[PDB]
């Protein structure tokens, strides 16, 4: 049962990632990081075919997921002028948890002595943050610019990590899939541009992600089956 095996591999990766993220005092005051298991799935497939030793795979996958966790944790830092005292300390620990997770991935890669992977990820983290600011400052102008920024923020880790190992497919696949997922899960993009309807943007995104899943992955490979069912769930 190849579905069973890949679900067992994801479950192990999920457990090692959670242990690595945990801190007893963070655990008592802020919510555990919300791990995207689609990104987990796609990082596992990407590092399956990368030119690295088998017993390094898990560390590389966790490293990539630690970066994701750092990025996602800081998205939850609020901009509310005054707040409650228990809610301010929560905000303080959220800022610290994200920086802590950054320290952990840099520390993981140093132990493996992979200095170039450090460069790749740091370059990706810089562009993801430039384009978060762009998207947040509503600094774009075109359907092209806006969508070029959404795809960078949502898939540039896969982009840059794939390039690092000269792997095709992953840049377009992750871009189509996670842009669709981010847009499905924004309502004001039409106030600084337009072009087609909200329901036309979404279903065009669904078609691009549907097509890439069916084209860039083997038919009824376990990852294709998972991702295709995930597209349906996200649409629903």
């Amino acid at each position: 049962d190849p579905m069973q095996d890949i679900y067992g591999t994801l479950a192990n990766l999920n457990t090692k990632l959670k242990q690595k993220l945990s801190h007893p005092y963070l655990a008592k005051h802020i919510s555990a990081p919300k791990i995207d298991e689609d990104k987990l799935l796609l990082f596992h497939a990407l590092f399956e075919e990368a030119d690295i030793k088998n017993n390094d795979r898990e560390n590389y996958i966790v490293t990539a997921m630690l970066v994701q966790s750092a990025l996602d944790t800081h998205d939850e830092v609020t901009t509310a002028r005054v707040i409650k005292r228990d809610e301010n300390k929560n905000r303080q620990l959220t800022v610290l948890a994200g920086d802590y997770f950054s320290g952990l991935y840099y520390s993981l890669l140093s132990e493996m002595k992979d200095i170039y992977m450090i460069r790749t990820l740091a370059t990706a983290i810089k562009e993801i943050n430039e384009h978060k600011i762009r998207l947040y400052d509503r600094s774009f102008k075109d359907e092209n610019d806006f969508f070029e920024s959404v795809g960078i923020v949502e898939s540039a880790l896969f982009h840059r990590v794939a390039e690092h190992f000269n792997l095709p497919r992953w840049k377009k696949l992750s871009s189509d899939f996670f842009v669709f997922k981010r847009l499905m899960n924004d309502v004001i993009g039409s106030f600084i541009q337009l072009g087609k309807t909200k329901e036309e943007i979404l279903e065009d995104c669904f078609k691009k992600a549907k097509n890439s899943i069916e084209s860039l992955l083997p038919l009824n490979s376990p990852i294709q089956n998972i991702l295709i069912n995930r597209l349906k769930t996200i649409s629903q």
Partner: protein, 308 residues
């Protein structure tokens, strides 16, 4: 005699902070102008003179540490809800917390970019573990706000993570970037640690003993915010002082706090804290006395003398 190399570091710094994005570009210039004199590059360059000193390599260690510290200020201001820092407005005030997060993250990732020009994996091992240790200390600081039942080792770990480690690794990383021998860069690690520990103890003493005019802020601000420092640890051995110190919390006013500071200063807590600071300064002079005499040992010896 470092002014030309320190000028090299600043030109690199200034060029590593431009951006085609105007918001990021302008936030970068604002961090360039934060702070007073750059302290960390001096420790890096002086320790680099104990190997094959080469500004075109070791400058990348100084830029990385400067950029890291810049990344910390931006996030410190969100943690502190600071609208002004050292008399100037903050990134988060000019913009907001979310923008401060992203700019800080952009700066921290840029420093890791910078440090990868040092292809020595030992340098990344030391720096990465330092950053983890600093974050852990910031997290333990929140946990221990107003914790008047903590012991000395809690405080010692707090100021190692906040201050000493970073001086320690500014020294070690300077020497390592220049190929210094193991015996030399580990002894420079210990000098920086011992010098930083004694500096931070002095800083904490001064927070009680200086006037508002010297500090540029009210006296006792560490204690008001819940950060227990060394004079409070000795003062807490006085039961009547401890009965007051245990009641300090986030709503305590400046006017309630200042009679307590006067009582602390009438114990022997200040003097007891001085003694610990000078034991650290002495252990820092021991480690220097193991290094080759020369311009670099003299300058580091000067720097420790100014601290005592």
């Amino acid at each position: 005699f470092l002014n030309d190399d320190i000028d090299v570091i600043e030109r690199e710094l200034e060029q590593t902070v431009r951006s085609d994005y105007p918001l990021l570009s302008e936030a970068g210039l604002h961090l360039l102008q934060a702070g007073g004199k750059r302290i960390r590059p001096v420790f890096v360059l002086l320790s680099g003179m104990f190997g094959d000193y080469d500004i075109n390599k070791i400058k990348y260690v100084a830029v990385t540490l400067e950029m890291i510290h810049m990344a910390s200020l931006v996030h410190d201001d969100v943690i502190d809800d600071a609208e002004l820092r050292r008399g100037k407005p903050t990134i988060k005030a000019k913009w907001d917390n979310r923008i401060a997060m992203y700019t800080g993250d952009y700066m921290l990732a840029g420093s890791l970019e910078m440090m990868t020009r040092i292809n020595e994996p030992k340098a990344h091992r030391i720096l990465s573990q330092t950053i983890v240790e600093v974050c852990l200390g910031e997290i333990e600081q929140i946990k221990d706000k107003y914790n008047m039942e903590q012991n000395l080792r809690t405080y010692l770990r707090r100021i190692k993570r906040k201050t000493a480690l970073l001086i320690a690794v500014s020294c070690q990383l300077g020497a390592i970037a220049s190929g210094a021998d193991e015996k030399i860069h580990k002894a420079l690690y210990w000098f920086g640690y011992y010098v930083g520990m004694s500096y931070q103890i002095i800083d904490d003493i001064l927070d009680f003993t200086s006037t508002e005019e010297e500090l540029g802020k009210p006296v006792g601000g560490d204690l008001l915010q819940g950060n227990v420092t060394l004079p409070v640890l000795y003062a807490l051995k006085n039961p009547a002082l401890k009965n007051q110190l245990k009641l300090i919390n986030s709503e305590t006013t400046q006017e309630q706090l200042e009679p307590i500071i006067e009582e602390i200063k009438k114990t022997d807590a200040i003097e007891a804290s001085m003694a610990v600071s000078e034991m650290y300064l002495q252990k820092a002079f021991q480690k220097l006395n193991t290094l080759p005499r020369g311009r670099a040992r003299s300058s580091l010896a000067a720097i420790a003398k100014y601290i005592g």
